[PDB]
Ligand binder design. Structure first.
Ligand SMILES: Nc1ncnc2c1ncn2[C@@H]1O[C@H](COP(=O)(O)OP(=O)(O)OP(=O)(O)O)[C@@H](O)[C@H]1O
Ligand SMILES: Nc1ncnc2c1ncn2[C@@H]1O[C@H](COP(=O)(O)OP(=O)(O)OP(=O)(O)O)[C@@H](O)[C@H]1O
Ligand SMILES: Nc1ncnc2c1ncn2[C@@H]1O[C@H](COP(=O)(O)OP(=O)(O)OP(=O)(O)O)[C@@H](O)[C@H]1O
Ligand SMILES: Nc1ncnc2c1ncn2[C@@H]1O[C@H](COP(=O)(O)OP(=O)(O)OP(=O)(O)O)[C@@H](O)[C@H]1O
Lengths: 386, 386, 388, 388
């Protein structure tokens, strides 16, 4: 009947099919997928969530370096030696899931707690003759980054752009009008259009396809806004190139059944109005944060910048998170930056961390397709007039 | 085609059917309706909006007292003698509309810029055994007032309550759950339900049925939230009585073609969690405020408290604005308080002013009906189970 | 061995001998402060949950003090039973360990208090326009202003004569010697040197103060603000008066016995004379108030006073003031406490009233080994005995 | 009659004799500051709209100074033409009243400036560790700290010897006599009394200062900060040095003639020595900068300087410092201004640089009737002439 009663039933039967190892290697299959790790974390949510700030899935971190061992990352405010912790507080090293699928449990010091100057940043902020990924999109109050030139799959098949919802939508005013570079009250700019569809919170069952936690009120922070280009807008100013990266391919969907090496540990790049071109590493997926109001919130992609340099700054929200080319293939996008420190090494200090929204799932919810070539763009314009 | 092009056409033809009095009494018909005053104000919006903070329609105010002369109230920050004003600044005394309908122009000093203790306030805040109009409804952050026990007209015909949207809906979190008296993080309370439909901004053409201004971006601040009662909620705790007023009748719709005496100048009463029972006078309708972002905003009902006492305080939002009985008839509701001073007399200081939303139009937009007797309530419960 | 192990033993014994009970024997009804404190101590856990604090006294119904012995439970918002969870709703009666039973009253209440200016002849006199120093006089260190509570003499030792005030005003341990002046310190204005603090109390454990375990917390401390300032050698005792201005000549300290009828303290009219509000009257509403912080420590305050006719009993700066019972049969009024270094809602018609906190004078005088001087002859005699 | 009616006449005449023009005669290109200022004055309205301010100088292209005479127009955000309204986009060339034409350059620019500490031997010396007082020395009133600009002598009257600094630092008209000390005022630290301000300039009208109508505003004023502090009678002149520490011996003031080639000022390297940043170098980027407030008044600043190698030319406290041209052919370096009591974006690669404001020294010296002393012999001679 109710979604809560359905979720309680699913976890009820997982407990009902259960049985209880003297230091022997786990007999069950080791996790090799994101779904495997997420299922184990869901079953053991309560005592993972206790004495913890959040949880995520990925590979174990040892001495600041990413291993190849699938793991549930448990985030703590202060990581101390086991000798100073109570036996209840010390988290396990291995967790056994419902169907025998097992994984490791890593502990990472973590907290949920500037404008860079380059030729690119100048171009993205209004000096370039073209609008594209990275361009500063602004409403009358907030500044953000254009993520992708998109077209609607159904209906009018309208051509527009995708960015983060918080930057585009402020539901304290009637229309949400977007301009580049600045809105009329703050500076020069051209009217791009208004937000027509937006997503803020999606339930985990619809987003991931599985129950990612025990909380009846569990929502994914799926920030996303589609702005159809205005009728008077000139599409010849639009480019499908990601400046600083080049021509990109189509969205790479995050399949929960694929090997973790396909996402976790992969190098990613982003181009935004505030920090320009940065590179980073995907460190975790499906981060869980529990507020004081009883709601469990999920963020898809967790990225840490490379070489102890921040991956994003305030204003890079909406930027496209693009996988780097491994085999000469065109780099493919996997996420957008959502609207934050972790301590990896003892020698150095805390590094910054950023959040991303799964692009494939966001594009599905908003029923949007990414335009990756100029030929496709002009074709999509013609299809819109149709 | 576009709504702006339709609005521009309507005002274009009104200008096209035009012609130009030596102090002779206006030959046209004097306004006798809200629509008449609103049409004249719409035609002359520009130079009424210039050298002004806002405009509204009602009766002229002379020496602090309400006259019987239909008028367009022009609100100014400082009212000075004509000798100290430039000829362009001095507003006219009479304005002639498109079809010869004429009205007067009144000038009122105005600005858009506490908990009372009584037995009633205590009952409304959680000491009474019943929930009804006036009861403190609270989300996890904002406190407000329950306006009316309502039932949906169509669909499931669900029974719930009406309050102001801003108090119930905060679109920074997934669900908007309402409790009485307090939410779980701040104190004891019972779960009432969650918001299922809400209205924030309606265009003037849909709300009023006419173009109330020349601005292409013109919206009515029609704050409203319907919260269907939870399945587990006990309806025997619900009362249809307005404590401090008694049994009330059905909504009195504000017809724009009725004589102005039916609304302007009428005594109204409200019962809220913060100020309790207060009385006031309806002073104006369809107040226009122009922001710095180019959007024209409209508020329906303007109320000033009687005897220089405030009509509302922060927290009375959602309260039902009820007309007082003139002929022994049950008092009938006309509005809800929306989520502020005017100088009427020289002897005393500035009085406070409050805003109301047209209940008939809000009930139509949300497709809701007010329940005014316990028999009707239990009948509506049975119809919901149906 | 440890006090915690002794306290844990005491409550473990009470649980072991407990025989649970419907309607319960009348005549086993509490008639003492100790009776109410023992019941509250046993049921500390279930009372401390969903509550800001507890105290013992008389049940309050419709804002008026009844004669029914009760444990007052203080809540941030008092709501109707229908909006409460069954676990949240408090009992109306609680049976103690030995079958002694009492009532459980609920009061809306807040701790939002750290401690304005009232203008009268007394306030002016207390602040430095009187030719005499006594109870109510402004005592000032270099930073904080307070009120002189009582002219006192030490029981043992040199038997020195000085005055009593609150310790948080007198002692600021960030510097070595705490010097008091009247009216003002030399950095802010004119004044004479009264002396320096020689002994002070801040926290006493409940087993020492009350003589019983008032709670289950291994860390339970009574906020017993108290400071003795022996008068300086050069100080002129002829400037000192033992009269409480606004009340007159006072009797000796009235000790608060826990076995006496609650009538003797709860509900009694009290008066105070302080530098900030002058003469005010109030009513003792509760005894032994428990507050649980976020750091796990339980704190106790002795006397709770609410001003009469919806007027505040004290203001910031009145700390140190003597809380004095009113005369009932013409007897000289007798002091029972000092104001410690705060709102409750009693009536639905009116708004929240302020509450103030008092320290048990008899127990503070015992810990500090001080005696109150109530007549000028006793003063001069004590000055001579100090020289002896 | 009125200055406004005279100014309105001047521009009414220029419009009446104006013969509008495609490509326009080269050789009628501006070659002077006056030429650029006259074109900007005529076109003030269309330039002041959509702009934060204007100045005259050389066009800037790709962050480098060109040799093309231009009116620099300062904008909060410089965007590509495609995101601009046709009315918003500025011209590339503007023809003046008499056919004299110039270019129109756009620069990102902000007025976010009211005026840190740099550590060096010079700064220490200027702040009170040197045995001599001169240009760069910290001059202090009881509230504000500044920089001694130049040792000066009055041309007429008693011909008294004193020093020149900025008036906002020297004069605070909320009290009668403005006393200067070095290094510090008596309320804050040690120091010797230098003297009190006897004459000061704050606002001069543009017709008096420049000799022309620099704008169409009836209310147009040049921010001409300047204060003369005659040395006290008791002051010891042997402590005064005419050397600019960090530069050496300087020549006499180089006047800024509006009819001279822009090469003579725009783009020239300048140096300054102040109490806060010490010795810094910069480049003169523009002259006669116009700022329009919200109260309807147009204000003008003479010299605009940007520091070299992306380092700030000045800091708060450097006001009063002498802006000194660098030597080109071994000649003694000559002063051209003083720093008035501020960011621009030149390059896309790097970030916003700071800009500072200077007052025309030759015109400030004229209004205040002062002459600069550039050698110790001239100093002592002037001391004797004052006694005469
Ligand atoms: N609740 C907790 N809060 C803080 N620290 C904890 C907690 N539980 C365990 N720890 C600490 O975390 C350690 C485990 O760290 P982790 O699982 O990351 O180890 P690792 O990957 O083998 O090595 P490395 O420490 O290099 O990452 C425990 O030994 C203990 O010191
Ligand atoms: N733009 C304006 N700003 C301020 N004051 C104005 C403006 N235009 C007109 N007024 C003032 O308002 C006056 C008109 O006031 P109004 O129309 O309310 O008069 P009334 O109703 O006859 O009398 P009363 O002043 O008693 O209300 C003018 O005479 C003038 O002094
Ligand atoms: N945990 C709680 N938090 C808030 N309110 C509570 C709580 N438990 C009980 N109450 C409220 O307090 C009421 C009991 O109040 P109380 O003990 O003061 O009664 P009383 O002395 O008979 O009457 P009066 O309300 O007139 O003082 C309950 O009926 C309920 O409405
Ligand atoms: N009102 C305005 N606000 C902001 N930017 C403007 C405005 N008017 C013009 N611009 C921008 O300034 C440009 C002209 O800049 P400018 O005069 O400095 O050119 P330049 O000297 O040839 O080159 P550079 O940009 O390298 O300095 C226009 O093409 C347009 O992009």
């Amino acid at each position: 009947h109710s979604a809560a009663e359905g979720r309680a039933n699913y976890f009820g039967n997982l407990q009902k099919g259960l049985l209880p190892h003297p230091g022997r290697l786990p007999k069950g299959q080791q996790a090799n997928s994101l779904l495997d790790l997420m299922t184990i974390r869901a079953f053991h949510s309560k005592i993972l969530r206790r004495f913890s700030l959040g949880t995520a899935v990925g590979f174990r971190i040892r001495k600041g370096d990413l291993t190849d061992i699938p793991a549930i990352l448990v985030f703590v405010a202060r990581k101390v030696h086991k000798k100073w912790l109570n036996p209840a507080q010390c988290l396990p090293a291995i967790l056994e899931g419902p169907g025998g699928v097992w994984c490791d449990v890593d502990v990472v010091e973590f907290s949920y707690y500037e404008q860079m100057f380059s030729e690119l940043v100048d171009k993205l902020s209004g000096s370039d003759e073209s609008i594209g990924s990275g361009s500063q999109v602004a409403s009358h109050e907030t500044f953000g980054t254009l993520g992708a030139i998109v077209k609607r799959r159904t209906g009018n098949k309208q051509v527009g752009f995708l960015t983060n919802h918080h930057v585009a939508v402020d539901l304290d005013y009637p229309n949400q009008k977007m301009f580049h570079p600045l809105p009329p009250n703050l500076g020069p700019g051209v009217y791009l259009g208004a937000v027509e569809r937006a997503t803020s919170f999606i339930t985990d069952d619809v987003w991931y396809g599985i129950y990612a936690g025990t909380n009846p009120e569990t929502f994914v922070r799926a920030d996303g806004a589609f702005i159809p280009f205005a009728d008077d807008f000139d599409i010849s100013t639009v480019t499908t190139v990601v400046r600083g990266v080049g021509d990109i391919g189509d969205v790479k969907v995050i399949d929960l059944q694929s090997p973790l090496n396909s996402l976790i540990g992969r190098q990613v790049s982003k181009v935004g109005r505030s920090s320009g071109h940065t590179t980073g590493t995907v460190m975790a997926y499906a981060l869980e944060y529990n507020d004081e109001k009883g709601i469990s919130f999920f963020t898809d992609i967790l990225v840490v910048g490379e070489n102890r340099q921040t991956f994003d700054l305030e204003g890079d929200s909406g930027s496209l998170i693009i996988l780097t080319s491994q085999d000469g293939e065109k780099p493919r996008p996997i996420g957008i930056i959502w609207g934050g420190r972790l301590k990896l090494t003892s020698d150095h200090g805390p590094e910054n961390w950023t959040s991303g929204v799964d692009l494939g799932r966001l594009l599905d919810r908003l029923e949007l397709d990414i335009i990756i070539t100029n030929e496709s763009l002009q074709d999509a314009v013609q299809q819109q007039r149709f």
